Design a protein around this nucleic acid. Structure first.
Ligand SMILES: [Zn+2]
Lengths: 346, 98, 91, 282, 96, 49, 168
DNA sequence: TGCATCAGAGCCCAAAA
DNA sequence: TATAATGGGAGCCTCTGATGCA
């Protein structure tokens, strides 16, 4: 009933490794990867493609899926085909298949046996914007990375290497997923630096620092303007569903007008303007109404240069400017006489 | 100029002025939305021969039913002694109407 | 109640002090400021293994001050903290 | 628990293969398996172990449930339940009835039971969960975006863990996390702890919350609405009124009828046209 | 609210009053031209400033919101005519 | 009461910092983060009922 | 035509995909610098429609009478912005997920069809217990495994992986 | 089979903020 | 990218109907 408690119980069913067991699994994993490289040489087949086939057979029929990197769609037909090329190897070659198979198995066990380590690291990162289980899963992701890169020859225990990768994975997740507006990981680093810096400055100064004081503390390149710009980018949005006083009766979003959809008055006004504009353009020639529409964008919305408008009507860049001026002149004359367009000037 | 009569050089309504609904308290301009020059407005502006301004009138006005005598104005910019505003805010003006 | 904070590192509480307000009451209302005092706490860090003692007065932030008439100024606005009736602890 | 099959020559299986009694193991068919099990190929001991175990298909989650839902012939289950409707026991007849009513519901309607399990999750149009810049240039956004974000993150992580062949513990934790994430989006708080934004106790508002309740879509915006051409003021007694009359303040009436007043201002010369009339009223 | 230049809330109980009076067109105005019917409210303003009578209303936008919110819940909501053929209240905009 | 809550939270950060840091160079200023405390009081005064 | 009836029915995964104008592949919302929507994110203009009327995202096709064009560069249809209230997206789950209404609304509809209690349906959906599709001749404690039987983790592993043991 | 136990369902309007 | 590190942490009313029990 409690998703954390459940996961913790499952984690506790895989016994921790002895130093011997730990070294053995790590050793088998390293040997298996070397075998996959070797099997690549023999066959002339993609090392990654081979690895997925080996891994497919260990995990079982349960998990079979397309892999983004594989050039061929990976389905039981192809893994049987490729597995049969592997089962066609001579005894001294076919043994590398057995090595690879046993490698994947040990990889699985090594990961499963270190899962409690991730939990003990992840529990320390709560409250930074990721849920506990989310932190556990990203931490687990780092543990997988760690198992593939671990070099057992160095005689260091596994926990030593994993912890680096697990910490790295959790910190990347927090930087990547914690914000509704996503921020580049490096920019988050600068923001966090500014926080630490400002908090230090407030601890010596007995008050919150100004923008200028932070710029000093940040070193060269930083002025007060830049501290302010950085804080602006770092602002997180607020919920439209934020309650507003009263009781449980109103939402913050209910007080926000909609500026996009026109109000009845605004919509009406813009429509009437288009129709009155067309009325005046029908009093011109077809060519001089099109010239104006093309120059001011009442077509595509962009204002064409004289060279482009001239090229569409076949005239000189000076000519299209001229027919525009008599168009505006005829237009200007009709306006002082008929007073149609006066009210739209606001 | 009738509309701006009671605003000082800086755009703030003068102390002692009587303000009625619709009157400008603080004049303010905002840069037009990036869509802004509608093609309809481009042709209209062209007819009267007035370039469409880059900024729009966002001035603070007296709401319906309110108004009175201006008894105070407070103006706070960024970069003046003693004042630091929330990030992004250049200046804040407060007008007290009695 | 909170101190001492144990593990061989142990942090113990000595005493706290409240400074004077950075701005007077009227000024806070003008500037949308909270009328408040800086709070500091004298703490001594002890290493139970080594015996090493580093002692310092750390700044804990500000605490809002009540005016003479029993109210507060919080972000420039005057506020009242209403007493709350409830069931007394006991058996 | 394994059978030991020593081999002199090459072995035809490999570690991880599953095997039934009689399958050829090594040495061109000479040695074969006596039991059901999982093949473990020992190159040191020069023996093929087969660990006794079955090819059983057993699953967890909505994937298992979806299969069982697909494997329903509703006509057949109707027959079974019809036979049950004759049983002497009062409780027995009742239980077959409740079941039979859901079955018949699906039968008449044309809905397949497996649709109660989601594969593609719909995404609401953005303007109904907006991200808007408020007055200060600050952003205000609907809770649904965070609920969707949780879902997408966990789904993508699930895709990655699957492609990299993580152990079942990792995949199971991830899958159960994925179900909970869909749950929060559709009806948050229904099962388990309500998902909240960080540093707030406020449950995020899910689709179910939007639809239902006093503040929900039906009662707030559908069976009732805020309206135009409306006003409010303090009431005062009007003894001089005839029964069909009320006193209406002129300033109220000018706003409520404003469009009508603009047109009438055009008939009379008070303004050149409707646009100028409105500008005069500002 | 007055500060937003708001309209008055015509709530559940107010609709009942209009229902008990049998004022179907008055009520329909409240539900459409005077609220969230976008085409309707736009058309009504233009008609009033032109001296024409207000036009027949269209679908209230908050019903469309309700439909899309039910689609987000994996429920298919279909408007039908008397022949049980689908009627499209989005006028082709949401269908490929 | 709100002060006490913020103080308990501040202690969590302190205890957590007394492990991951340097066992040699640590002051009380490096060990104590007051943000949890400031927030509890700021929360009470601004948003309490 | 006049609306005389409103039907409500379940939606297939196929139908949910037929509504959808695109898959939302990223938790991103809008870009922190440009404030424009992130491609493939929740606000993406390539999926739900243009933010501005008859204007594509990059602004190659900016005017009317181009209704229906989809800009090759930015991928956005030139149409009315009102469509961002209408067009649905979708997320393709890597594993099916139950719609909680059909799980937690008692008596459960899924549970009722399959003769599964509230506890049993919980245990399968939330990964507490296995359910058997094909026993393939399994036996546990002397009795054959029957289809639609619930197995614990310990029970499944003994069946699936065997009962090996290590003694220190 | 008839009784108990628990999970889930509701709990005034408008106004204001 | 390498000393070793391996299982979390918290809490404040009535009716109706299904579910689990002699
Ligand atoms: Zn484009």
């Amino acid at each position: 009933s409690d998703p954390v408690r459940q996961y913790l119980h499952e984690i506790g069913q895989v016994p921790l490794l002895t130093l011997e067991e730990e070294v053995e699994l790590a050793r088998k994993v390293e040997e298996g990867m070397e075998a996959i490289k070797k099997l690549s040489e023999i066959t002339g087949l993609d090392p990654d493609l081979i690895r997925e086939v080996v891994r497919a057979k260990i995990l079982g029929s349960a998990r079979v899926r397309h892999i983004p990197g594989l050039k061929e769609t990976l389905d039981p037909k192809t893994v049987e085909e490729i597995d049969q090329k592997l089962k066609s190897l001579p005894k001294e070659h076919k043994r590398y298949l057995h090595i690879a198979r046993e490698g994947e198995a040990a990889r699985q066990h090594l990961i499963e046996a270190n899962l409690r380590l991730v939990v003990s690291i992840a529990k320390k990162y709560t409250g930074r914007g990721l849920s506990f289980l989310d932190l556990i899963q990203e931490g687990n992701q780092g543990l997988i990375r760690a198992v593939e890169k671990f070099e057992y020859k160095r005689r260091f225990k596994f926990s030593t290497y994993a912890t680096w990768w697990i910490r790295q994975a959790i910190n990347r997740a927090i930087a990547d997923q914690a914000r509704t507006i996503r921020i580049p990981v490096h920019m988050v680093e600068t923001i966090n630096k500014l926080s630490r810096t400002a908090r230090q400055l407030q601890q010596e100064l007995g008050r919150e620092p100004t923008y200028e004081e932070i710029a000093e503390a940040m070193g060269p390149g930083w002025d007060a303007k830049r501290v302010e710009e950085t804080l602006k980018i770092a602002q997180e949005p607020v919920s439209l569903e934020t309650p507003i006083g009263d009781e449980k009766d109103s939402f913050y979003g209910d007080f926000i007008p909609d500026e996009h959809l026109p109000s009845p008055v605004d919509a009406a006004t813009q429509s009437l303007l288009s129709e009155e504009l067309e009325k005046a353009l029908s009093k011109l020639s077809e060519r001089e109404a099109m010239v104006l529409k093309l120059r001011k964008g009442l077509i595509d919305g962009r204002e064409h240069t004289l060279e482009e408008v001239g090229a569409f009507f076949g005239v000189t860049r000076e000519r299209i400017r001229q027919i525009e001026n008599k168009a505006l002149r005829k237009l200007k004359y009709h306006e002082s006489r008929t007073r149609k367009l006066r009210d739209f000037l606001d | 100029e009738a509309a701006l009569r009671d605003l000082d050089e800086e755009g703030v309504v003068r102390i002692g002025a009587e303000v009625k609904p619709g009157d400008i308290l603080v004049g303010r301009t905002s840069f037009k939305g990036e869509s802004e020059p509608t093609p309809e407005e481009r042709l209209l502006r062209s007819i009267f021969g007035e370039k469409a301004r880059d900024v729009k009138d966002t001035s603070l006005r007296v709401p319906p039913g309110e108004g009175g005598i201006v008894v105070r104005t407070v103006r706070l910019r960024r970069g003046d002694p003693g004042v630091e505003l929330k990030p992004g805010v250049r200046e804040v003006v407060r007008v007290y109407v009695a | 109640e909170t101190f001492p904070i144990e593990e061989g590192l142990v942090l113990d509480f000595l005493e706290y002090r409240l400074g004077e307000p950075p701005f007077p009451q009227d000024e806070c209302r003008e500037k949308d400021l909270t009328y408040q005092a800086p709070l500091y706490a004298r703490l001594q860090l002890i290493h139970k293994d080594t015996g090493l003692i580093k002692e310092d007065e750390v700044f804990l932030g500000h605490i809002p001050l009540m005016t003479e008439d029993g109210s507060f100024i919080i972000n420039g606005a005057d506020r009242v903290i209403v007493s709350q009736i409830h069931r007394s602890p006991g058996v | 628990k394994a059978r030991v099959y020593p081999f002199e020559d090459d072995v035809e299986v490999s570690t991880g293969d599953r095997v039934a009694p009689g399958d050829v193991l090594a040495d061109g068919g000479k040695v074969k398996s006596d039991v059901y099990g999982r093949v473990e190929v020992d190159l040191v001991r020069n023996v093929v172990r087969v660990v006794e175990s079955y090819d059983i298909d057993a699953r967890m989650g909505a994937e298992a449930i979806q299969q069982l839902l697909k494997e329903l012939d509703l006509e057949a289950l109707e027959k079974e339940l019809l036979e049950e409707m004759k049983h002497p026991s009062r409780a027995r007849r009742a239980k077959a009835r409740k079941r039979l009513e859901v079955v018949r519901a699906f039968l008449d309607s044309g809905n397949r039971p497996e649709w109660m399990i989601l594969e593609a999750v719909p995404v609401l149009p953005p303007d109904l969960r907006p991200m808007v810049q408020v007055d200060g240039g600050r952003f205000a956004t609907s809770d649904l975006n965070d609920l969707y974000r949780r879902l997408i993150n966990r789904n993508n992580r699930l895709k990655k863990l699957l492609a990299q062949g993580a152990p079942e513990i990792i995949i199971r934790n991830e899958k159960r996390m994925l179900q909970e994430a869909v749950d929060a989006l559709l009806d948050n708080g229904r099962r388990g702890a309500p998902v909240t934004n960080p540093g707030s106790d406020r449950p995020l508002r899910s689709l179910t919350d939007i639809l239902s309740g006093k503040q929900g879509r039906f009662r707030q915006n559908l069976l009732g609405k805020r309206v135009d051409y409306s006003g409010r003021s303090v009431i005062v007694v009007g003894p001089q009124l005839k029964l069909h009359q009320c006193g209406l303040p002129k300033r109220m009436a000018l706003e409520l009828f404003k469009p009508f007043l603009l047109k009438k201002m055009e008939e009379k010369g008070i303004a050149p046209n409707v646009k100028a009339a409105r500008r005069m009223l500002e | 609210g007055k500060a937003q230049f708001g309209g008055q809330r015509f709530g559940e109980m107010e609709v009942w009053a209009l229902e008990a009076y049998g004022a179907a067109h008055t009520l329909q105005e409240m539900l459409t031209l005077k609220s969230d019917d976008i085409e309707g409210r736009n058309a009504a303003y233009e008609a009033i400033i032109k001296g024409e009578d207000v036009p027949e209303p269209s679908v209230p936008e908050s019903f469309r919101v309700l439909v899309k919110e039910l689609q987000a819940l994996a429920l298919d909501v279909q408007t039908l005519d008397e022949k049980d053929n689908p009627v499209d209240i989005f006028e082709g905009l949401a269908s490929k | 009461d709100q002060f006490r809550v913020g103080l308990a939270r501040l202690a969590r950060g302190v205890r957590e910092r007394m492990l991951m840091g340097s066992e040699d160079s640590l002051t009380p200023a490096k060990l104590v983060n007051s943000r949890p405390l400031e927030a509890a009081i700021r929360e009470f005064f601004s948003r309490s009922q | 035509k006049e609306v005389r009836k409103v039907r409500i029915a379940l939606a297939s995964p196929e139908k949910i995909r037929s509504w959808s104008y695109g898959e939302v592949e990223k938790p991103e919302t809008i870009n922190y610098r440009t404030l424009k929507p992130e491609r493939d994110g929740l606000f993406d203009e390539r999926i739900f429609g243009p933010i501005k009327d008859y204007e594509c995202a990059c602004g190659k096709y900016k005017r009317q009478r181009f209704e229906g064009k989809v800009c090759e560069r930015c991928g956005v249809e030139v149409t009315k912005s009102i469509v961002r209230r209408y067009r649905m997206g979708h997320i393709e789950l890597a594993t099916p997920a139950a719609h909680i209404w059909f799980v937690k609304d008692v008596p459960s509809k899924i549970g009722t069809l399959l003769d599964l209690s509230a506890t049993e349906l919980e245990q399968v959906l939330y990964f507490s217990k296995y359910i058997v599709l094909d026993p393939k001749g399994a036996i546990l404690n002397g009795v054959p495994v029957e289809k639609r039987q619930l197995l614990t983790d310990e029970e499944y592993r003994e069946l699936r992986y065997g009962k090996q043991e290590t003694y220190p």
